[PDB]
Design a protein around this nucleic acid. Structure first.
Ligand SMILES: [Mg+2]
Ligand SMILES: [Mg+2]
Ligand SMILES: [Mg+2]
Ligand SMILES: [Mg+2]
Ligand SMILES: [Mg+2]
Ligand SMILES: [Mg+2]
Ligand SMILES: [Mg+2]
Ligand SMILES: [Mg+2]
Ligand SMILES: [Mg+2]
Ligand SMILES: [Mg+2]
Ligand SMILES: [Mg+2]
Ligand SMILES: [Mg+2]
Ligand SMILES: [Mg+2]
Ligand SMILES: [Mg+2]
Ligand SMILES: [Mg+2]
Ligand SMILES: [Mg+2]
Ligand SMILES: [Mg+2]
Ligand SMILES: [Mg+2]
Ligand SMILES: [Mg+2]
Ligand SMILES: [Mg+2]
Ligand SMILES: [Mg+2]
Ligand SMILES: [Mg+2]
Ligand SMILES: [Mg+2]
Ligand SMILES: [Mg+2]
Ligand SMILES: [Mg+2]
Ligand SMILES: [Mg+2]
Ligand SMILES: [Mg+2]
Ligand SMILES: [Mg+2]
Ligand SMILES: [Mg+2]
Ligand SMILES: [Mg+2]
Ligand SMILES: [Mg+2]
Ligand SMILES: [Mg+2]
Ligand SMILES: [Mg+2]
Ligand SMILES: [Mg+2]
Ligand SMILES: [Mg+2]
Ligand SMILES: [Mg+2]
Ligand SMILES: [Mg+2]
Ligand SMILES: [Mg+2]
Ligand SMILES: [Mg+2]
Ligand SMILES: [Mg+2]
Ligand SMILES: [Mg+2]
Ligand SMILES: [Mg+2]
Ligand SMILES: [Mg+2]
Ligand SMILES: [Mg+2]
Ligand SMILES: [Mg+2]
Ligand SMILES: [Mg+2]
Ligand SMILES: [Mg+2]
Ligand SMILES: [Mg+2]
Ligand SMILES: [Mg+2]
Ligand SMILES: [Mg+2]
Ligand SMILES: [Mg+2]
Ligand SMILES: [Mg+2]
Ligand SMILES: [Mg+2]
Ligand SMILES: [Mg+2]
Ligand SMILES: [Mg+2]
Ligand SMILES: [Mg+2]
Ligand SMILES: [Mg+2]
Ligand SMILES: [Mg+2]
Ligand SMILES: [Mg+2]
Ligand SMILES: [Mg+2]
Ligand SMILES: [Mg+2]
Ligand SMILES: [Mg+2]
Ligand SMILES: [Mg+2]
Ligand SMILES: [Mg+2]
Ligand SMILES: [Mg+2]
Ligand SMILES: [Mg+2]
Ligand SMILES: [Mg+2]
Ligand SMILES: [Mg+2]
Ligand SMILES: [Mg+2]
Ligand SMILES: [Mg+2]
Ligand SMILES: [Mg+2]
Ligand SMILES: [Mg+2]
Ligand SMILES: [Mg+2]
Ligand SMILES: [Mg+2]
Ligand SMILES: [Mg+2]
Ligand SMILES: [Mg+2]
Ligand SMILES: [Mg+2]
Ligand SMILES: [Mg+2]
Ligand SMILES: [Mg+2]
Ligand SMILES: [Mg+2]
Ligand SMILES: [Mg+2]
Ligand SMILES: [Mg+2]
Ligand SMILES: [Mg+2]
Ligand SMILES: [Mg+2]
Ligand SMILES: [Mg+2]
Ligand SMILES: [Mg+2]
Ligand SMILES: [Mg+2]
Ligand SMILES: [Mg+2]
Ligand SMILES: [Mg+2]
Ligand SMILES: [Mg+2]
Ligand SMILES: [Mg+2]
Ligand SMILES: [Mg+2]
Ligand SMILES: [Mg+2]
Ligand SMILES: [Mg+2]
Ligand SMILES: [Mg+2]
Ligand SMILES: [Mg+2]
Ligand SMILES: [Mg+2]
Ligand SMILES: [Mg+2]
Ligand SMILES: [Mg+2]
Ligand SMILES: [Mg+2]
Ligand SMILES: [Mg+2]
Ligand SMILES: [Mg+2]
Ligand SMILES: [Mg+2]
Ligand SMILES: [Mg+2]
Ligand SMILES: [Mg+2]
Ligand SMILES: [Mg+2]
Ligand SMILES: [Mg+2]
Ligand SMILES: [Mg+2]
Ligand SMILES: [Mg+2]
Ligand SMILES: [Mg+2]
Ligand SMILES: [Mg+2]
Ligand SMILES: [Mg+2]
Ligand SMILES: [Mg+2]
Ligand SMILES: [Mg+2]
Ligand SMILES: [Mg+2]
Ligand SMILES: [Mg+2]
Ligand SMILES: [Mg+2]
Ligand SMILES: [Mg+2]
Ligand SMILES: [Mg+2]
Ligand SMILES: [Mg+2]
Ligand SMILES: [Mg+2]
Ligand SMILES: [Mg+2]
Ligand SMILES: [Mg+2]
Ligand SMILES: [Mg+2]
Ligand SMILES: [Mg+2]
Ligand SMILES: [Mg+2]
Ligand SMILES: [Mg+2]
Ligand SMILES: [Mg+2]
Ligand SMILES: [Mg+2]
Ligand SMILES: [Mg+2]
Ligand SMILES: [Mg+2]
Ligand SMILES: [Mg+2]
Ligand SMILES: [Mg+2]
Ligand SMILES: [Mg+2]
Ligand SMILES: [Mg+2]
Ligand SMILES: [Mg+2]
Ligand SMILES: [Mg+2]
Ligand SMILES: [Mg+2]
Ligand SMILES: [Mg+2]
Ligand SMILES: [Mg+2]
Ligand SMILES: [Mg+2]
Ligand SMILES: [Mg+2]
Ligand SMILES: [Mg+2]
Ligand SMILES: [Mg+2]
Ligand SMILES: [Mg+2]
Ligand SMILES: [Mg+2]
Ligand SMILES: [Mg+2]
Ligand SMILES: [Mg+2]
Ligand SMILES: [Mg+2]
Ligand SMILES: [Mg+2]
Ligand SMILES: [Mg+2]
Ligand SMILES: [Mg+2]
Ligand SMILES: [Mg+2]
Ligand SMILES: [Mg+2]
Ligand SMILES: [Mg+2]
Ligand SMILES: [Mg+2]
Ligand SMILES: [Mg+2]
Ligand SMILES: [Mg+2]
Ligand SMILES: [Mg+2]
Ligand SMILES: [Mg+2]
Ligand SMILES: [Mg+2]
Ligand SMILES: [Mg+2]
Ligand SMILES: [Mg+2]
Ligand SMILES: [Mg+2]
Ligand SMILES: [Mg+2]
Ligand SMILES: [Mg+2]
Ligand SMILES: [Mg+2]
Lengths: 271, 47
RNA sequence: GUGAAAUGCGCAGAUACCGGGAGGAACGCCGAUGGCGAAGGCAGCCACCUGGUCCACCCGUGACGCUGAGGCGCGAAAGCGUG
RNA sequence: AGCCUACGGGCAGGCGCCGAGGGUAGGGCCCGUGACUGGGGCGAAGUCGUAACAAGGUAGCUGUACCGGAAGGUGCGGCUGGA
RNA sequence: AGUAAAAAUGUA
RNA sequence: CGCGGGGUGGAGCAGCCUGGUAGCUCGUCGGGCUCAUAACCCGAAGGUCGUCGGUUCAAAUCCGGCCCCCGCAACCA
RNA sequence: UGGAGCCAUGGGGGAAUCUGGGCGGACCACCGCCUAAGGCUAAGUACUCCGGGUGACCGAUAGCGCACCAGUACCGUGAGGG
RNA sequence: CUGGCCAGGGUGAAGCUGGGGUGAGACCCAGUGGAGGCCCGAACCGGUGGGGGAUGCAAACCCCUCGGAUGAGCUGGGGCU
RNA sequence: CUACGCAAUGGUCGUCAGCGUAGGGUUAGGCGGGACCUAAGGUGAAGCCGAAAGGCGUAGCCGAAGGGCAGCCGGUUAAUAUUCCGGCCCUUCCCGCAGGUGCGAUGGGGGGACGCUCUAGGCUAGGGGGACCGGAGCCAUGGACGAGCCCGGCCAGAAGCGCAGGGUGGGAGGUAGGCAAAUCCGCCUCCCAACAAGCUCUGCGUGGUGGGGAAGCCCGUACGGGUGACAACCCCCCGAAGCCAGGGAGCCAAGAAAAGCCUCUAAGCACAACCUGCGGGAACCCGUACCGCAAACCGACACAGGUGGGCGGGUGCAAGAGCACUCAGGCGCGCGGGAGAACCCUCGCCAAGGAACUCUGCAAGUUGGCCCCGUAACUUCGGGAGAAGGGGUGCUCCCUGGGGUGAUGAGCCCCGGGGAGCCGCAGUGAACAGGCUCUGGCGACUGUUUACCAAAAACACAGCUCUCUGCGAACUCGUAAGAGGAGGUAUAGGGAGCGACGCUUGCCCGGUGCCGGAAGGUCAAGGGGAGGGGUGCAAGCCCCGAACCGAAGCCCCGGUGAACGGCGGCCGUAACUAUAACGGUCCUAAGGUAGCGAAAUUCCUUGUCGGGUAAGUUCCGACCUGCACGAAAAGCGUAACGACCGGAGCGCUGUCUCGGCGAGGGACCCGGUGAAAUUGAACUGGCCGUGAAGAUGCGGCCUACCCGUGGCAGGACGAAAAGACCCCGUGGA
RNA sequence: GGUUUGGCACCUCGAUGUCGGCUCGUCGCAUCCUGGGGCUGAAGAAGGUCCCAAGGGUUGGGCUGUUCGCCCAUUAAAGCG
């Protein structure tokens, strides 16, 4: 719903926070699955490779199940839904009957108690994972594999989701969150429903910290630096680029396409 | 004001230590260079 | 395409025809000097939820009525905010 | 610390409350005035078009929105006070 | 098979 | 003032480079249409090519001299 | 880059066993040299930490940085300077 | 990566609770509550204006003054470029 | 630490010392490290990569103020002590005995285990009183033999007890999971039990008992020793930020790991073995002096600087780690002694005036705490607010209301309320302790920055838009392997500009960029070889070489502005004049819209009017002929915020008219110690003149006894720095 | 004449600090006052103009960094170098 605050301090007049109603009945992670020290650090061996990262609240990684074919036919009651500092989404802790339990990117609609499962069979209803092919051409689904037995990799950000457009061979056509039309395999699992917490896109950070709390350092504009730093740099008295919108490395940043030309992944796309 | 030198034994040994000098070929040369020269301490003395 | 034209579209294969798919909006005939609602206004079909309205029986209450400054709700279209 | 006494006491006198009024500060209501600017009223002489009244030569009018030297044009819906 | 082009302005 | 662009019928532009030919639009004058005036139609007239000199057989045209119009520039102290 | 062979080889193609195969400065024909795609081999040659011998070499601001308890004192985080 | 520190005041958000309100509401009052790159101001961090200092106490200092002071805060130790 | 010492070191002195010579001095199963654990990271079997050198890298290994682990109170030394000693209390290993039990991991599970802010109830630390307890003593100087003054009224302590809390359901079935191997976890099912109890675990109180135990007086160099009493060792009150601790509540940014430690079982092995007792043995290595906000550390120095954690008492002030004084404890800053100049520094006051000072109220003053009334425009309804502007404030006595502790009564604390009355110039009587308001500009705001001349209108910022990226993502680093991105997946990640919020953001794809275009044009290697050449008697062996087929790119076609960017000229025309709504014409890709406008932009320029002043190149309001605004290098606004830059008032002032006096530190004199830049040599005057054009040094003339000391700053083209400007160099970056 | 703007480039680039103000002055006379004086289109008062003459005087504010100006209120005058 997004909570709002009276303006009793600027930087909090617009600030808004997500309505943590859904999570409820569990805030402290599952000391069993999750208990994974997440490694923080904004670069590789030595040098920083992604500018402006670092700082920002401590964080424990909740290990989740991105491939459901593990326990086919084995059902599981959705025990709870919790907060996961590692994604836009929320996650549902579910207890499989095997006794074993794991985490799943909590879809919009999921209710605690509501039992669910995955398999070729499985009732076509939110929370159940089935090979794309065994799914009603139309129904919306999220957490989609891209290649059989390779794990879920599509539509996992709060409220994202893909829709089945149709079939064609061993493949099925998906309209991905971005809007591109791709031909995913049939054997590619995918759990029915949309990602949920769709309210996410609506939070207003508010201050400059908060942006810090999320580990995102300040971003200094090219034209502010000098010739040596960025190409937009230099210029006595603020100026305007000098043509034509480029990045610190040299490439243009307005328009110029990037994806590998002759990539074999093409010819499976159309948008 | 705080000056450039802020003594710290662990640091000193770990940085210019005999062991350290031996790991890198560049360091090995330093050692060689010194011995060749006739220094009394190949490495910074520090107990 | 018009009064006639021109812009524009098409020999990179348009217009015209057939097959396939996507998507959005609107619901032809029925349809009317018709119906419903307090007003604005309401049209494919199905279901669920629901308001008002009319007829017959004279069964019940027993003047419990009418209007209504203010208040309150509704209120075409265009317009504004967020997605 | 005086003055009369009939020594209880009264008087003068001193202190304080309130207090006209003066002073400081901050407000409220009304009036005059002000470089410049916004429309409005009437104009016996000007400039530009011609919007509306006869399909007024694109029915008109209208709430709204946008745009235009101006009247006004066009969009969405509405009215007949048009056919 | 009768919806259908343009053509302003002017009183001594 | 220093490099550079320009003055051609009444207005606004060609023509100059590739010297011997002054073109275009509006306006002005004559006649129509109209009751009338615009518009519309038909027909005409109108230019020292800034100025003084030079080259040449001939100069708006090419060469220097001034007259003005417009545009850059006039920086380090 | 030249008329550019010879010797080596990253890439592609890809033989022959003496009627075999390379070379003699493109390339041909002559004439002639030599036997690739396995390996080894003293001596004559280089240098001077070390020992000795000399010197129209220095003689303590010279001569090695050091004639002396010097790569020390001292300086530098350090390499290093000295 | 792991530890530590932030005197004492001030203001008084959302929530709760109770009353009012309506058909149910929105909402409105109190009391509670203790939010915030909130306020004042030490430590701690900083370095605004002025003066002094200028072979200095000091190769950046001293005094007065001033800014932040629960945060994008300050800080020790162990690390990496 | 001690004994001898004083050359040098010490800014003087020096018998002293951190100095010289010598001798001592550092004692641990429990404190801290290691024979424990893991973090970032390092290393690194395997494995990948790399011209060599090397670079990655799973497990493992290293890596600690983090986790884990058993010592408290006293006493002694010249110098060490949780280390030696005394009392009290623990910990492991090993062997033995006894009694228990399926014992047993490098494996399984649990646990260890975690944020921020706010917090409850108890405790202790610490502190304050006491008429009570113990104790030498003391009546001074006018008064007091006094409930007088003065000093001390604690520490540790096993079991056992009490008091606070912390943890925790007990059963019995199944069981497809915990890379099943489990009686353990985990899941389903159901007799039971409960906002518990029971069982455990800390803290605190108590505890056999063991220590400690002043003031003053006597000895006394030193340091300390009897004294001291058989000392007392009790009662209330205040009370943590610490403990009980893994307590509670709220919140979003969602808060290490591993071992120890429980338990489950596998091999194994049960004459094992582990478990609880109880005896007796065993228990290593390293550190321990001393300095430690500093004279012992970093700053060449005994340097006014820098340096992390804990304790840090009392009274008063609303609070407090603030301010004043002061305990304990530590110091008086390792040159002194006199003077009583100018001048400098720091500091106090000042007649009348009160910003006239000046670039500028720069500096300084004013104001200041708290309680109480009382407060404007504007506003995003939070704020503006401490707006402003006022009143109160000490002490005395009387009356009176709550709360905490008790016990509902009492003292003891904690907040109040109303009366009278007292003295000063003055009551936050000293110290800490805002001056205010009006109006502009820029930026929204807290924040960041040029360590050492710039703190800002600059960067950042939430937020807006464009663009890329479908995941072995784009992108970044790397030769690569690999890594970041991300153990993320378009509500996400990269790049770019703008920069809260409000109203908005026009027109121009000609040129440039990017995006789309299976056509054409052009296009390399290569394919193809018409045709030609060199040689051979030749078969041949060699060379060139036209057609034509041949990518990307460019061309061409089209799109695109919150992509780079651009967004006109000349004439004419309306009742006086003006001006031009209107028109003509040339050019363009299209000719700048709204809104602003002598502005952080306006040259002319102090434009022209208004306002404000006695007077206003600034400031504010207007007008627009805008040299040279203008919409995301955003346009115009905006409450709040600002050590930002401007203009005004009020307040108050030594800024000033205009200076005066006073204080302290220097300066000055004496004793001690004793530098520096600079320096061709000097026996170094003025004026006119001359000279390389500004002379103590030449000419003429003038003046002038030799030498100092305190002062001033005109000259010695005074010092300093082989001029940053300028030019030159076929100089550099 | 040597106070402006310049011209030339002679000393100085192993450095001659380069506007304005303040403090402190000092000199020139081509005199702004004040003292003498000649003409006058000098009635008087007041001026104009030239001559002699620096001895001493030559104000305080607004604006601007300003010099300079302009302005306010004065003055015997508000001199120039
Ligand atoms: Mg690494
Ligand atoms: Mg930025
Ligand atoms: Mg810059
Ligand atoms: Mg760089
Ligand atoms: Mg560029
Ligand atoms: Mg560049
Ligand atoms: Mg500029
Ligand atoms: Mg640039
Ligand atoms: Mg140093
Ligand atoms: Mg260390
Ligand atoms: Mg040796
Ligand atoms: Mg076809
Ligand atoms: Mg019905
Ligand atoms: Mg009845
Ligand atoms: Mg609508
Ligand atoms: Mg709009
Ligand atoms: Mg809308
Ligand atoms: Mg929309
Ligand atoms: Mg009164
Ligand atoms: Mg008025
Ligand atoms: Mg009017
Ligand atoms: Mg007229
Ligand atoms: Mg009309
Ligand atoms: Mg009409
Ligand atoms: Mg309309
Ligand atoms: Mg239109
Ligand atoms: Mg209509
Ligand atoms: Mg007319
Ligand atoms: Mg008429
Ligand atoms: Mg002409
Ligand atoms: Mg005519
Ligand atoms: Mg006509
Ligand atoms: Mg230049
Ligand atoms: Mg080869
Ligand atoms: Mg080959
Ligand atoms: Mg053979
Ligand atoms: Mg060969
Ligand atoms: Mg050959
Ligand atoms: Mg040969
Ligand atoms: Mg040959
Ligand atoms: Mg040969
Ligand atoms: Mg051989
Ligand atoms: Mg061989
Ligand atoms: Mg050999
Ligand atoms: Mg030899
Ligand atoms: Mg020598
Ligand atoms: Mg000698
Ligand atoms: Mg030698
Ligand atoms: Mg030597
Ligand atoms: Mg050193
Ligand atoms: Mg050293
Ligand atoms: Mg409340
Ligand atoms: Mg704050
Ligand atoms: Mg503060
Ligand atoms: Mg303050
Ligand atoms: Mg502290
Ligand atoms: Mg800083
Ligand atoms: Mg400081
Ligand atoms: Mg300062
Ligand atoms: Mg500064
Ligand atoms: Mg200073
Ligand atoms: Mg100074
Ligand atoms: Mg402060
Ligand atoms: Mg740190
Ligand atoms: Mg370190
Ligand atoms: Mg002695
Ligand atoms: Mg001495
Ligand atoms: Mg000694
Ligand atoms: Mg270890
Ligand atoms: Mg380990
Ligand atoms: Mg590790
Ligand atoms: Mg390695
Ligand atoms: Mg440790
Ligand atoms: Mg520890
Ligand atoms: Mg000691
Ligand atoms: Mg002991
Ligand atoms: Mg067992
Ligand atoms: Mg675990
Ligand atoms: Mg006591
Ligand atoms: Mg007496
Ligand atoms: Mg006790
Ligand atoms: Mg507490
Ligand atoms: Mg381990
Ligand atoms: Mg051992
Ligand atoms: Mg010690
Ligand atoms: Mg200090
Ligand atoms: Mg400390
Ligand atoms: Mg000293
Ligand atoms: Mg010091
Ligand atoms: Mg510091
Ligand atoms: Mg400190
Ligand atoms: Mg106190
Ligand atoms: Mg106080
Ligand atoms: Mg203090
Ligand atoms: Mg003392
Ligand atoms: Mg005074
Ligand atoms: Mg006075
Ligand atoms: Mg005054
Ligand atoms: Mg002034
Ligand atoms: Mg002045
Ligand atoms: Mg000041
Ligand atoms: Mg304010
Ligand atoms: Mg204000
Ligand atoms: Mg008193
Ligand atoms: Mg108590
Ligand atoms: Mg105070
Ligand atoms: Mg204050
Ligand atoms: Mg303005
Ligand atoms: Mg301004
Ligand atoms: Mg700012
Ligand atoms: Mg700086
Ligand atoms: Mg600042
Ligand atoms: Mg915005
Ligand atoms: Mg490569
Ligand atoms: Mg990852
Ligand atoms: Mg981004
Ligand atoms: Mg993005
Ligand atoms: Mg900007
Ligand atoms: Mg336009
Ligand atoms: Mg364009
Ligand atoms: Mg284009
Ligand atoms: Mg185009
Ligand atoms: Mg293209
Ligand atoms: Mg070819
Ligand atoms: Mg041939
Ligand atoms: Mg091509
Ligand atoms: Mg005319
Ligand atoms: Mg006229
Ligand atoms: Mg413009
Ligand atoms: Mg405009
Ligand atoms: Mg002005
Ligand atoms: Mg401008
Ligand atoms: Mg101007
Ligand atoms: Mg100007
Ligand atoms: Mg005025
Ligand atoms: Mg003023
Ligand atoms: Mg004015
Ligand atoms: Mg002023
Ligand atoms: Mg203005
Ligand atoms: Mg601009
Ligand atoms: Mg735009
Ligand atoms: Mg722009
Ligand atoms: Mg802006
Ligand atoms: Mg503005
Ligand atoms: Mg500020
Ligand atoms: Mg700030
Ligand atoms: Mg201001
Ligand atoms: Mg004195
Ligand atoms: Mg002396
Ligand atoms: Mg001379
Ligand atoms: Mg001589
Ligand atoms: Mg002379
Ligand atoms: Mg002297
Ligand atoms: Mg002096
Ligand atoms: Mg001088
Ligand atoms: Mg000099
Ligand atoms: Mg030079
Ligand atoms: Mg420089
Ligand atoms: Mg001169
Ligand atoms: Mg001159
Ligand atoms: Mg010269
Ligand atoms: Mg010459
Ligand atoms: Mg020079
Ligand atoms: Mg010199
Ligand atoms: Mg003078
Ligand atoms: Mg004279
Ligand atoms: Mg007279």
């Amino acid at each position: 719903a997004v909570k709002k605050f009276k303006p009793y301090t600027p930087s909090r007049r617009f600030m808004t926070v997500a309505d943590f109603s859904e999570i409820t009945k569990t805030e402290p992670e599952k000391s069993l699955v999750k208990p994974l020290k997440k490694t923080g650090g904004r670069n590789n061996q030595g040098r920083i490779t992604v500018r402006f990262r670092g700082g920002g609240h401590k964080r424990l990684y909740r290990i989740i199940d991105f491939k459901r074919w593990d326990k086919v036919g084995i059902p599981a009651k959705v025990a709870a839904i919790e907060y996961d500092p590692n994604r836009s989404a929320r996650i549902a802790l579910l207890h499989y009957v095997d006794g074993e339990k794991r985490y799943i990117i909590a879809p919009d609609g999921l209710q605690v108690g509501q039992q669910v499962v995955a398999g070729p069979d499985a009732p076509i209803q939110v929370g159940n994972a089935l090979p794309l092919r065994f799914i009603p051409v139309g129904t919306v689904v999220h957490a989609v594999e891209l290649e059989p037995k390779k794990g879920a990799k599509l539509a996992r950000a709060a409220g994202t989701s893909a829709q089945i457009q149709g079939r064609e061979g061993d493949y099925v056509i998906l309209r991905l969150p971005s809007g591109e039309l791709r031909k995913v395999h049939g054997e590619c699992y995918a759990t029915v429903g949309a990602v949920g917490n769709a309210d996410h896109k609506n939070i207003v950070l508010g201050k400059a910290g908060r942006s810090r709390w999320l580990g995102r350092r300040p971003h200094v504009r090219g034209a502010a630096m000098n010739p040596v730093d960025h190409p937009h740099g230099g210029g006595e008295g603020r100026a305007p680029r000098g043509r034509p919108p480029a990045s610190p490395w040299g490439w243009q940043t307005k328009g110029l396409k990037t994806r590998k030309r002759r990539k074999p992944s093409s010819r499976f796309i159309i948008a | 004001m705080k000056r450039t030198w802020q003594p710290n034994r662990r640091k000193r040994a770990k940085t210019h230590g005999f062991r350290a000098r031996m790991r890198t070929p560049g360091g090995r040369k330093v050692l060689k260079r010194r011995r060749q020269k006739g220094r009394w301490r190949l490495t910074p003395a520090v107990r």
